[PDB]
């Protein structure tokens, strides 16, 4: 199968370069417009009750646009807000930007619009010392994405009022700053990561052309991957986070895939094979290894589709499209480029000891295999102790804390929450709905409200139980159906969300009406629950599919079960350190972030990426161990030769993916630091502790058992065209 494709990619080398590059280049220009068709929601279980409570509530009471923008206005020269001359100056500036942007702004609302008023909440829009006052600027739009795109049209002119002294906070100033970290992370990779991976590529090949090919394949991969997702956006929504994942993960392992193809090609050239025979032996070995490695990551990402979070679904599609296009380009464009170029892939040089490290790998493995229990036992018990911090796992939602504490937009929100306490609330909603269609009586409301007061832990700023669980305000865009009435109240502690939500759902609603418990604490706790309910079924599918794929890439049954254990150990040890640094705070003062509960759908993603990544690096290693073993060599020889003919490649393939990960660990977005650190930690763990010690030690204990497989299972692999674990007699 790969032997057949090895020679066909040489006979049609000119057209597979022309056609496949054209598709990858066509998707690039078609993918430039991808940033204009992305959404920000998908963190909640869309088929849950808290979401239903939000759909019903917005349909009846209307969407709330009061929290879109809150602008803190401060008069210069210590003037008080009662300065009539200053009020006239800023109101005209506000009336001016609304006049110029009627299509983006509904209007502005606040104490300035009525300085002499008797409304308490409007009079609370000013501080007791008359030095600050805030306004609400509701924005136009039918969904949260159109609203945010309207705030970004007016923010510069809005920021210029009051001599520039205006603090913008609320839902949209933060969302602009959160989604803006994406571009900050891309530009940081284009000026700091892609130059670093250029000098890493040159120190493995010594010539510019051999080093430039994996980068070209990686560029063609993301170019064609951004085009695939732009086509996906024509049918279903896609999230903003799916663009960095293509750069953070797809661009990294695509260069890794293109690395084993070019290295194996130069290896066959030095052995004395001609250009056609070389590209066929790489496809039978590295090309086969890369295809298996790509399908494994796919098998690591599809179980996330069991999870109902659309944020996850959009990301799996980006991982699938990036790793598969990478493998396809590796055995098409790259394999044919090596066929056209040939040994003048080593021609140019930098002007335009490789055998001594390969011996150091042999010496280290012989030390490991000589006293293996002295290496396996201390390593695996240390990794188990690194899983202990995972017991302190807490889960939360998005807030202004996802930015560094020195972020101006975050500070403007925190300044609002201390000058004007009471306006910012996260209430749990009791959405009452009658199936009669008849109005809900005032007694039905006071009855459901009386049951909500039997549940402690709810906010009471007035110090009166009669003022608790008020009705939600009715905006002028909602159909005031008296069949549906909702009452809401916030919590004294967010940590009581899961507890108090269950206490509200346990209340017996009035005879005819049915109650839906919603609010952002309910939305968060329902996405948490949906992940950890299908997390075991996800892990079951994740493990059995990756294991059988390695049984085909290799020829053994115990080797895939070994790697699964070494991948589970690397997983738990990596997530325990992350819980130790992003939840408990160890490393927050240096990396500039605040420890806080994690986004629950993000632990599902980090499980998928780390697993498929650690398995891929096991496939890169053992593929040469089995290939040497298939030549009749002993187990200790197959091990040594395995981790010596690839000990430099796997080392180099890890630094590249670590550099691009090291560029996202500086992201102002904290959950990107969590993801990029997870790749950085697991990469170092796999490429050093696992590869150099735990793999040779455990395989030495097993001996010839390492390669064993039942016979009725080896012929199946053989039957499919996947039994090319060993090469043919060739003369060169
Ligand atoms: C009128 C009917 C009221 C409805 C019930 C009250 C609801 C909450 C009202 C209190 C205001 C604060 C609500 C924050 C809740 C939104 C959380 C959320 O969506 O969740 C958001 C993130 O939440 C936040 O970032 C909170 C930031 C600040 C929120 C509050 C601002 C305070 C301003 C208060 C001014 C109001 C006073 C004006 C009255 C004067 C007349 C995530 O989402 P997503 O999945 O898409 O992507 C993630 C991208 N954000
Ligand atoms: C390959 C890996 C396979 C791993 C298999 C994992 C199986 C499932 C693990 C436990 C499942 C239960 O999931 C449980 O959800 C509740 C929801 O409150 C979490 O509760 C935790 O988070 C929520 C939200 O902050 C709150 O309860 C509180 O922060 C904390 O107690 C528990 O921490 C978690 O244990």
Q: Is 642 exposed, middle or buried (0-12, 13-18, 19+ CB in 10 A)?
A: buried
Task: Report which ligand 1 atom has the smallest distance to the Cα of 488.
Answer: 5
Q: 124: part of which helix (H) or strand (E)?
A: none
Residue 466 in tokens: 């009669």
Q: How far is CA 599 from CA 303, 500, 584, in A?
A: 18, 20, 15
Q: What dihedral do alpha carbons 377, 379, 380, 385 form, nearest 10°?
A: 120
Alpha carbon of 602 to ligand 1 centroid (Å) = 22
Nearest CA to ligand 1 atom 49: 175
Q: Which residues contact 358 (CB under 8 A, 6 or more apart)?
A: 644, 645, 647, 648
Q: Where is the chain broken, named by the residue before each break, C–N > 2.5 Å?
A: 352
Nearest to 643 by CA among 697, 680, 574, 685: 697
Q: What whole-number distance in Å separates Cα of residue 622 and Cα of residue 694?
A: 13
57 is in an annotated binding site: no
Read off φ and ψ for residue 159, nearest 5 degrees. -75, -15
Q: Three-class SS of residue 166?
A: strand
Nearest CA to ligand 1 atom 11: 424
Q: 119: part of which helix (H) or strand (E)?
A: none
Report the residue among 50, 424, 596 best suited for mutation to probe ligand 1: largest number of ligand atoms under 8 A from its CB.
424
304, 320 Cβ separation under 8 angstroms? no
Would you mind telling me the total number of residues written for the chain in this entry?
Answer: 732
Whether the CB of 147 sits within 6 Å of ligand 1: no
653, 620 Cβ separation under 8 angstroms? yes
Q: Three-class SS of residue 68?
A: coil
Q: Is 732 exposed, middle or buried (0-12, 13-18, 19+ CB in 10 A)?
A: exposed
Whether the CB of 175 sits within 6 Å of ligand 1: yes
Tell me the H-state helices in 331-394: 333-341, 354-370, 373-385
Report the residue among 389, 498, 499, 540 best suited for mutation to probe ligand 2: largest number of ligand atoms under 8 A from its CB.
498
Quick one: which ligand is closest to 174's CA?
Answer: 1
CA 305 to chain centre: 14
469, 455 Cβ separation under 8 angstroms? no
41 is in an annotated binding site: yes
Q: Three-class SS of residue 557?
A: coil
Alpha carbon of 526 to ligand 2 centroid (Å) = 12
Alpha carbon of 532 to ligand 2 centroid (Å) = 6
Nearest to 81 by CA among 14, 134, 160, 8: 134
Q: What whole-number distance in Å separates Cα of residue 255 and Cα of residue 266?
A: 16
Whether the CB of 109 sits within 6 Å of ligand 1: yes
Whether the CB of 507 sits within 6 Å of ligand 1: no
Q: How far is CA 410 from CA 320, 402, 406, 600, in A?
A: 35, 9, 8, 22
Whether the CB of 302 sits within 6 Å of ligand 1: no
Nearest CA to ligand 1 atom 5: 472
- How was this entry determined? X-ray
Q: What whole-number distance in Å separates Cα of residue 284 and Cα of residue 638?
A: 18
40 is in an annotated binding site: yes
List pocket residues of ligand 2, CB cut-off 6 Å: 393-396, 498, 528, 532, 535-536, 539, 597, 607
Task: Report which ligand 2 atom has the smallest distance to the Cα of 542.
Answer: 1
Whether the CB of 41 sits within 6 Å of ligand 1: yes
Q: What whole-number distance in Å separates Cα of residue 516 and Cα of residue 528?
A: 18
Nearest CA to ligand 1 atom 3: 64
Q: Three-class SS of residue 470?
A: strand
Report the residue among 535, 599, 611, 614 best suited for mutation to probe ligand 2: largest number of ligand atoms under 8 A from its CB.
535
Per residue in 284-315, is it b (16+ CB within 10 Å) or e — as a string?
bbbbbbbbbbbbbbbbbbbbbebbbbbbbbbb
CA 487 to chain centre: 35
411 is in an annotated binding site: no
Whether the CB of 412 sits within 6 Å of ligand 1: no
Alpha carbon of 212 to ligand 1 centroid (Å) = 48
Alpha carbon of 535 to ligand 2 centroid (Å) = 10
657, 679 Cβ separation under 8 angstroms? yes
Q: Three-class SS of residue 280?
A: helix
Alpha carbon of 170 to ligand 1 centroid (Å) = 7
Nearest CA to ligand 2 atom 30: 394
Whether the CB of 649 sits within 6 Å of ligand 1: no
First to last CA, the chain: 22
Task: Report which ligand 1 atom has the smallest distance to the Cα of 109.
Answer: 41
Residue 342 in tokens: 């040939």
Alpha carbon of 534 to ligand 1 centroid (Å) = 29
Read off φ and ψ for residue 323, nearest 5 degrees. -75, -30
Report the residue among 171, 180, 396, 518 best suited for mutation to probe ligand 1: largest number of ligand atoms under 8 A from its CB.
171
Q: Is 632 exposed, middle or buried (0-12, 13-18, 19+ CB in 10 A)?
A: exposed
CA 163 to chain centre: 40
Declared resolution, Å = 2.6
74, 546 Cβ separation under 8 angstroms? no
Nearest CA to ligand 1 atom 33: 67
28 is in an annotated binding site: no
Alpha carbon of 173 to ligand 1 centroid (Å) = 11
Whether the CB of 475 sits within 6 Å of ligand 1: yes
Q: What whole-number distance in Å separates Cα of residue 598 and Cα of residue 579?
A: 9
Alpha carbon of 50 to ligand 2 centroid (Å) = 19
Task: Report which ligand 2 atom has the smallest distance to the Cα of 607.
Answer: 1
167, 414 Cβ separation under 8 angstroms? no
Tell me the H-state helices in 669-729: 670-684, 695-702, 711-720
310 is in an annotated binding site: no
Whether the CB of 423 sits within 6 Å of ligand 1: yes
Alpha carbon of 520 to ligand 1 centroid (Å) = 9
Alpha carbon of 422 to ligand 1 centroid (Å) = 13
Q: What whole-number distance in Å separates Cα of residue 322 and Cα of residue 561?
A: 27
């Amino acid at each position: 199968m790969f032997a057949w494709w090895g020679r066909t990619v040489y006979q049609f080398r000119y057209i597979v370069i022309g056609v496949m590059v054209a598709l990858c280049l066509g998707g690039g220009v078609y993918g430039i417009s991808l940033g204009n068709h992305v959404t920000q929601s998908g963190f909640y279980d869309e088929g849950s009750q808290s979401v239903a409570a939000s759909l019903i509530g917005d349909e009846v009471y209307g969407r709330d646009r009061t929290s879109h923008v809150v602008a803190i206005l401060t008069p210069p020269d210590d003037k008080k807000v009662t300065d009539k001359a200053w009020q006239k100056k800023v109101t005209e500036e506000l009336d001016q930007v609304v006049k110029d942007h009627e299509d983006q702004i509904v209007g502005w609302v606040g104490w300035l619009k009525a300085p002499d008023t008797t409304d308490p909440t409007v009079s609370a829009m000013k501080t007791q010392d008359l030095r600050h006052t805030f306004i609400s600027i509701p924005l136009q739009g039918d969904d949260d994405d159109e609203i945010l795109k309207n705030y970004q049209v007016v923010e510069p002119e809005l920021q210029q009022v009051n001599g520039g002294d205006i603090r913008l906070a609320g839902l949209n100033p933060l969302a602009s700053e959160l989604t803006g970290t994406i571009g900050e992370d891309q530009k940081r990779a284009e000026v700091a990561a892609i130059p670093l991976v250029a000098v890493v590529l040159f120190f493995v090949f010594g010539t510019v052309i051999a080093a430039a090919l994996p980068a070209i394949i990686g560029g063609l991969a993301i170019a064609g991957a951004l085009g695939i997702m732009r086509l996906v956006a024509e049918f279903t929504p896609v999230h903003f986070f799916a663009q960095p994942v293509v750069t953070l993960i797809g661009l990294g392992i695509a260069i890794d895939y293109g690395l084993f193809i070019v290295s194996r090609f130069r290896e066959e050239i030095a052995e004395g094979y001609d250009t056609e025979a070389a590209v066929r032996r790489t496809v039978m070995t590295s090309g086969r290894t890369v295809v298996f490695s790509a399908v494994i990551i796919v098998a690591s990402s599809v179980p996330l589709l069991l999870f109902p979070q659309g944020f996850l679904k959009s990301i799996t599609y980006a991982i699938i499209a990036s790793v598969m296009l990478a493998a396809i380009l590796s055995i098409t464009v790259l394999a044919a480029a090596l066929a056209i170029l040939g040994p003048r892939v080593d021609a140019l040089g930098v002007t335009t000891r490789e055998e001594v490290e390969r011996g150091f790998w042999g010496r280290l493995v012989n030390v490991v295999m000589k006293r293996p229990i002295a290496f396996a036992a201390p390593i695996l018990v240390v990794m188990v102790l690194l899983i202990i911090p995972l017991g302190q796992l807490s889960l939360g939602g998005i807030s202004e804390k996802y930015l560094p504490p020195d972020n101006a937009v975050r500070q403007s929100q925190e300044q609002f929450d201390k000058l004007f306490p009471g306006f910012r609330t996260e209430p749990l909603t009791l959405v009452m709905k009658r199936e009669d269609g008849e109005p809900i009586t005032d007694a039905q409301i006071a009855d459901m409200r009386a049951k909500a007061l039997t549940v402690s832990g709810f906010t009471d700023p007035d110090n009166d139980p009669e003022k608790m669980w008020k009705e939600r305000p009715a905006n002028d865009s909602g159909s005031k159906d008296p069949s549906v009435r909702v009452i809401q109240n916030g919590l004294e502690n967010r940590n009581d969300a899961a507890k108090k939500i269950d206490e509200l759902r346990a209340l017996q609603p009035p005879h005819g009406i049915e109650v839906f418990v919603g609010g952002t604490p309910a939305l968060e706790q329902d996405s948490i629950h949906s992940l950890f309910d299908k997390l075991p079924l996800m892990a079951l599918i994740l493990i059995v599919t990756t294991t059988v794929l390695m049984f085909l890439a290799f020829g053994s049954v115990v080797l895939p079960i070994k790697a699964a254990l070494m991948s589970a150990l690397t997983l738990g040890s990596t997530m325990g350190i992350l819980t130790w640094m992003f939840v408990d705070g160890h490393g927050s003062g240096l990396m500039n972030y605040t420890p806080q509960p994690l986004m629950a759908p993000m632990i599902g993603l980090i499980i998928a990426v780390i697993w498929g990544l650690s398995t891929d690096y096991e496939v890169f290693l053992v593929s040469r161990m089995v290939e040497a073993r298939e030549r009749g060599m002993s187990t200790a020889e197959a091990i040594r030769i395995g981790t010596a003919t690839t000990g430099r490649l796997i080392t180099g393939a890890a630094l590249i993916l670590a550099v691009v990960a090291g560029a996202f660990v500086f992201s102002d977005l904290v959950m990107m630091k969590y993801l990029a650190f997870g790749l950085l930690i697991a990469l170092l763990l796999d490429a050093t502790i696992i590869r150099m010690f735990l793999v040779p030690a455990v395989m030495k204990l097993l001996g010839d058992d390492c390669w064993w497989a039942p016979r009725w299972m080896k012929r199946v692999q053989e039957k499919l065209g996947l039994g090319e674990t060993e090469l043919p007699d060739e003369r060169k």
